């Protein structure tokens, strides 16, 4: 049996069906979360307030992921696993998080920065929940190349393209920290070592 | 008014072509909806006019529009434009909108000379990918037909004009070229006429 826990932010909200065996812990997190986000601003035109039900449960997973130890089986694990499975089955109908993020740009009025946040929150969560990406995703483009109805080529640019390339590296480190973090960090160690030896 | 009135009685007016310019969105909108026409014809001169045709087509995406493309090398009132260059620039944007039936004209006569445009392989010359057209228009070519009212002696006068390949049409601003010259009308528009005395 599940107890309705209304994650809300002024106007809009999302009804989360929490198993009553773990309502004690989830009501705790409803409280803490509900103060830290700001107050509504008529159409949600500010840069810390979610403009859709989807972003709201995004913000939530973000908060909950920050409180989890990635080794230690902490108090807030079984909460996170069941906030994802709500997020997946409601807003993410088999499709990937990036598809969702696109819908939200053209249908609603969310900014880029707002939906990169949503992307981070989901992807961060999945790794903190010990539910990694090991499934061969049924991406259309790759079902097609498997069959022979597509041929792919990868191309890599060089210089001349942008004034500040480095903001592209910044935006990679923020948003995909959990996937790329150890490559960025192995890069720097390698470059630092290459300076000292040269 | 006369078309609306005639179309409402059921007179067989399949289409209306608007020569010499392209209407504004709100006038074309009136011509599309209000008149009982299967399709509208537009004859743009410049790249800017080809854009104004695309905007009419975006705004009524179920209605067929025949973009009748004619270069400066055509008979009667003519633009200054090449026939090829503007198409190579715009063909891609025209084909985005699938209610534009894209029709070439200016300089055609036989099958042989117009086949490259049907096949698409005309744009292979200028190292673009093949780029084919939906139909052709023949003005000049048809003016010595049996059933046109053009006077027996003016048909002899036409047949005597040798004419000139595409590369040389632009000499008609200076002097007779294939027995043909440009000449300002009362408005100041150019016109290609047979260089009689």
């Amino acid at each position: 049996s599940t107890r309705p826990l209304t994650l809300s932010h002024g106007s809009l909200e999302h009804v989360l069906l929490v198993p009553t065996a773990s309502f004690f812990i989830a009501s705790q997190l409803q409280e803490q979360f509900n103060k830290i986000l700001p107050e509504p601003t008529e159409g949600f035109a500010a840069d810390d307030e979610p403009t859709t039900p989807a972003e709201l449960v995004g913000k939530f997973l973000g908060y909950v992921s920050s409180l989890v130890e990635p080794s230690k089986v902490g108090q807030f694990d079984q909460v996170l696993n069941l906030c994802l499975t709500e997020f997946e089955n409601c807003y993410l109908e088999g499709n990937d998080i990036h598809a969702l993020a696109a819908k939200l740009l053209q249908e609603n009025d969310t900014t880029l920065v707002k939906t990169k946040e949503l992307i981070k929150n989901y992807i961060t969560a999945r790794i903190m929940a010990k539910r990694p990406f090991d499934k061969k995703s049924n991406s259309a483009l790759f079902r097609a190349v498997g069959e022979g109805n597509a041929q792919l080529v990868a191309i890599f640019g060089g210089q001349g393209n942008t004034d500040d390339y480095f903001e592209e590296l910044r935006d990679l480190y923020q948003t995909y920290h959990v996937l790329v973090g150890d490559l960025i960090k192995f890069s720097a160690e390698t470059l630092s070592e290459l300076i000292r030896t040269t | 008014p006369l078309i609306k009135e005639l179309r409402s009685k059921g007179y067989p007016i399949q289409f209306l072509t608007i020569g010499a310019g392209v209407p504004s969105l709100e006038v074309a909108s009136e011509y599309i909806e209000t008149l009982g026409l299967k399709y509208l014809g537009l004859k743009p001169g410049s790249i800017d006019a080809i854009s104004q045709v695309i905007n009419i087509a975006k705004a009524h995406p179920n209605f067929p529009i025949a973009l009748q493309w004619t270069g400066g090398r055509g008979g009667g009132h003519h633009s200054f434009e090449d026939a090829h260059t503007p198409m190579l620039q715009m063909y891609s944007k025209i084909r985005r909108h699938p209610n534009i039936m894209l029709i070439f004209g200016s300089g055609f006569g036989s099958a042989d000379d117009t086949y490259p445009y049907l096949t698409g392989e005309w744009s292979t010359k200028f190292d673009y990918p093949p780029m084919p057209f939906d139909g052709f228009l023949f003005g000049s070519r048809v003016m010595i037909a049996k059933e046109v009212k053009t006077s027996p002696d003016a048909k002899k006068c036409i047949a005597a004009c040798t004419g000139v390949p595409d590369d040389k049409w632009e000499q008609t601003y200076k002097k007779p070229t294939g027995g043909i010259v440009t000449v300002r009308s009362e408005m100041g528009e150019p016109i290609h006429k047979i260089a009689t005395r």
């Binding site: 990937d96 990036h98 696109a102 259309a140 483009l141 109805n149 | 063909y91 039936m101 049907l118």
Partner: protein, 66 residues
Amino acid sequence: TLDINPDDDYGFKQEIFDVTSNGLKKNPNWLEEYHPKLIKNKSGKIFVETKFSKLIGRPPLLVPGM
């Protein structure tokens, strides 16, 4: 980049991941879309089939208003 092309000429990341048929989008090869074709009637009259003749039901040649 993630973003939205209005003209839909090219795609962004979405396409790589998308699972629906909005992931496999093909740009038009003009030579194949607008290939001219032949077609017959019951009466065995051959036509040149283009986007334009398909509509008007007559050959894709027109005499303009002179």
